[PDB]
């Protein structure tokens, strides 16, 4: 039974001058760097606990003593992602309800109904990149989101977004990506009920209407036409909790539809990022992965069996997850007083952050080269001990997307490799962007295509 770390308090301000930045994740890192695997955190009001190693968070992951918590983050974008599946308590009524009636539409097997739908956009993107006149260059992130919100808007409610057919985008995208930055924003905020606020708080209203009116519309269309398609909606549509009996309400099928928006376009669009980035980094993976891509996606569209095959592309993938998490914290409380790893006791209702890109650099885990991009450590990943690697949380409340964002991730990413070959043509330095999700910022690339024709 020991004190727990914590850094400097300075009066009433407690430690809440240390996170004064634009980076709080990379600034949190660089505490766990000075204390260890475990630091309190205290500001006027909140208390929190950052755990970095395996061996506390394996405990934090234990589900029948610690829960998923809603962060301040989780609880402003509640306002317009509702009960859907990301902001929801555990104990809510649609949580389970939903949990229960998604669970079969993001399995392994349900990615075969989704396939097509991903190519479509994935064409889209590879073909935006093959018209590119020889001085332009491509903008990764940007690109990627372009992607991931159009094939969640395809595959979800079979909607076309044509976001690569936009210079600004489909004004859902405006308004949920703007309602998404006020959330941010909110977090930071001092007086949020001075009138200086007020116009924010307006359009605040006003995305979230923009939003629900486009959502409420496309489920009262699909309802009066009858159609039956390869989607989400239809699936949620259709549905029922064999638990409850219940179905999920028209207003809690709309939470859903905004939650798939929210929770995969900019975590995939990250993923994707990064892993380019690693790529043009690290010349003789790239070499590896292309060579993969050549040698599987051998038809001129890629089928769903060709990207289960692409096993290389998956460890790019992970080894890029292993450093840059895109969703690089979630956030837990205690269910009843208990003690963490033998040493600290924690009170009902306490707080605990797991810390992701730090416990994957827990060197007691992976060794001391935890700096080094090198996919090959997942050559054999039922070898990494469980709860070493954690991209997509813990348990029942982990990532039901998980299988979609990789699905997408491999067939684009191969697809990448397949058609292009990729200059890092600006020397590009990494600059971490954090929203509720991290991103390299200003990353560029030029792609030289490879003449290789798509099928139809
Ligand atoms: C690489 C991409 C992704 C990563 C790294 C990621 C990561 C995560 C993590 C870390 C959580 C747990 C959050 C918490 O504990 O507060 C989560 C939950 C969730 N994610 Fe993802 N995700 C990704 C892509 C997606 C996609 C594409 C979708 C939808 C199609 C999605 C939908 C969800 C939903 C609905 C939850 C809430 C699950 C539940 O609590 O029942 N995610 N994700
Ligand atoms: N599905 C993970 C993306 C994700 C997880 N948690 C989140 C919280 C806020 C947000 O905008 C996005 C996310």
Redesign the pocket.
Same mark, same amino acid.
Do not use: D, K, Y
């Given at each position: 039974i020991k004190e727990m770390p914590q850094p400097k308090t300075f009066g009433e301000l407690k430690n809440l001058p240390l996170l004064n930045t634009d980076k709080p994740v990379q600034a949190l890192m660089k505490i766990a760097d000075e204390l260890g695997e475990i630091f309190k955190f205290e500001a006027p009001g909140r208390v929190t606990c950052y755990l970095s190693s395996q061996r506390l968070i394996k405990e934090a992951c234990d589900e029948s003593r610690f829960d998923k918590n809603l962060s301040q @983050? +989780?609880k402003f974008?509640r306002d317009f992602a509702g009960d859907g599946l =990301?902001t929801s308590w555990t104990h809510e009524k649609n949580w389970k309800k939903a949990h229960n009636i998604l669970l079969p539409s993001f399995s392994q097997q349900a990615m075969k109904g989704y396939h097509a739908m991903m190519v479509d956009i994935a064409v889209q993107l590879v073909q935006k990149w093959e018209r590119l006149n020889a001085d332009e260059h491509i903008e990764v992130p940007e690109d990627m989101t372009r992607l991931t919100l159009d094939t969640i808007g395809l595959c979800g409610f079979n909607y076309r977004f044509n976001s690569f057919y936009r210079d600004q985008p489909h004004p859902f995208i405006t308004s949920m990506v703007r309602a +998404?930055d006020e @959330?941010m924003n909110k977090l930071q905020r001092a007086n949020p009920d001075d009138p200086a606020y007020d116009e924010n708080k307006r359009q605040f209203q006003e995305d979230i209407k923009v939003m629900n009116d486009l959502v409420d519309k496309i489920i009262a269309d699909r309802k009066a036409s009858g159609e039956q398609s390869d989607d989400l909606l239809t699936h949620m549509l259709n549905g029922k909790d064999p638990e409850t009996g219940e179905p999920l309400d028209d207003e809690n099928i709309r939470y859903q539809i905004i939650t798939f928006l929210? @929770? /995969?376009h900019?975590?995939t669009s990250g993923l994707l990022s990064f892993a380019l980035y690693f790529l043009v980094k690290n010349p003789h993976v790239l070499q590896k992965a292309a060579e993969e891509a050549a040698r599987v996606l051998v038809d001129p569209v890629p089928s769903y069996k060709q990207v289960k095959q692409l096993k290389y592309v998956g460890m790019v993938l992970n080894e890029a997850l292993r450093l840059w998490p #895109? @969703?690089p914290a979630?956030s837990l409380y205690a269910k009843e007083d208990t003690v963490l790893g033998g040493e600290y006791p924690l009170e009902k209702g306490d707080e605990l952050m797991v810390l992701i890109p730090q416990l994957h650099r827990d060197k007691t885990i992976w060794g001391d080269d935890v700096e080094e991009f090198r996919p090959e450590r997942f050559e054999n990943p039922s070898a990494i001990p469980q709860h070493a690697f954690k991209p997509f /949380?813990n348990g029942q409340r982990a990532?039901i /997307?998980q299988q979609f964002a990789l699905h997408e991730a491999t067939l684009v990413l191969g697809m990448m490799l397949k058609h292009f070959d990729f200059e890092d043509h600006t020397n590009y330095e990494l600059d971490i962007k954090e #929203? +509720? =999700?991290l991103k390299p910022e200003g990353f560029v690339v030029k792609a030289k295509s490879k003449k290789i024709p798509l099928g139809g």
């Open positions: @983050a +989780l974008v =990301l +998404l @959330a929210i @929770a /995969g900019e975590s #895109t @969703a979630f /949380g990532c /997307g #929203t +509720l =999700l």
